[PDB]
Amino acid sequence: VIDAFRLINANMMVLGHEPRQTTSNLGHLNKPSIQALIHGLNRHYYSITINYRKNELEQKMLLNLHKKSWMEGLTLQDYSEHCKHNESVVKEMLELAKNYNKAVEEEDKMTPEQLAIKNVGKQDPKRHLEEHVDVLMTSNIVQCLAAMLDTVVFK
Amino acid sequence: DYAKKRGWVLGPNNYYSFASQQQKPEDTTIPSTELAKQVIEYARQLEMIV
Questions:
Q1: A149 vs B29: CB contact, 8 Å cut-off?
Q2: What share of residues in chain B are helix, strand, coil (percent, to 5)?
Q3: Kindly report the CA angle at A32 between A28 and A34, in degrees rounded to 5?
C-alpha cells in the first residue's frame, strides 16, 4: 500500500484544481478509498498515480535472485529418507481412503446445500486424497528423473 | 551321412567336436534414457490442461 499526495490551495474551491486534459489520473487505473475520503482525499489536497520505471541494468538483475547453481539442480536428497517419507504418506493414505469409503457410501440423500453445512466440522475425506497424489507424484518423478540424469550425464 | 551332417561329428569311439553353449552378456542399464522418456511423458499427462 502506497500513496502520493499533492497539496492543493484551500482558498480556491470554485475553480478546477486539475483540468484533466485526459483520463489518466481519475477513476481510471485507481479508485479513491473511503478512509482517505474521510480525513481529506479530494479535500485540501489530492492524490497522484504511481508507476514504476525499470532500467535494463536492474531489470535483468531483479528477475534472477532466487535460483541456485548446479549443485542444487543435480542432487538426489537421500534414498533412506525418501523411502521412509513414501512409507509414511502411503500409511496415512490407507486410513484416509478407509474414511473415504464411508464418506462415499453414506452420502445421505439430502442435497449438498446442507451436506456442505455438515462438512464444516472436522470432516476431511475426498479433499486430502488429491493433495497426497500431488505430493507423491511431484516428489517421485522428479527424483527418478534426476537419478537418470545423474547416472548417465557423468558416466 | 550323420557323420557329415552338422556339428558334433562322430565315429572314433566317442562323439566329440563342435560344442554348443552360451555366454549371456548383459548391461541392462542401456534403456535408462528410454526410462527418462517414459517418466517425462508421465509428467506430460500430468500437465497438459484437460
A1: no
A2: 30, 5, 65
A3: 155
Strand, helix or coil for residue A155: coil
The cell numbers describing A22, all together, are: 485526459
Partners of residue A144 in chain B, C-beta under 8 Å: 35, 39
Residues 6+ apart with CB under 8 A from A49: A24, A25, A29, A30
Q: Considering only CA atoms, which of B44, B40, B23 is closest in space to residue B32?
A: B40
Experimental resolution (Å): 3.5
Q: How far is CA B37 from CA A136, A148, A149, in A?
A: 20, 10, 12
Question: Does A141 reach chain B within 8 Å, measured CB to CB?
Answer: yes
- C-alpha span between A155 and A20 (Å, rounded): 69
Size of interface A-B (CB pairs under 8 A): 21
Residue A7 is placed in which grid cell?
497539496
Residue B1 C-alpha, separation from nearest chain A C-alpha, in angstroms: 55
Q: What residues make up the domain containing A96?
A: 74-148
**CA dist list (Å): A88 to A83, A92, A124, A128:** 9, 6, 18, 15
Give CA angle at A151 (A89, B25), nearest 5°: 110
Experimental technique used?
cryo-EM
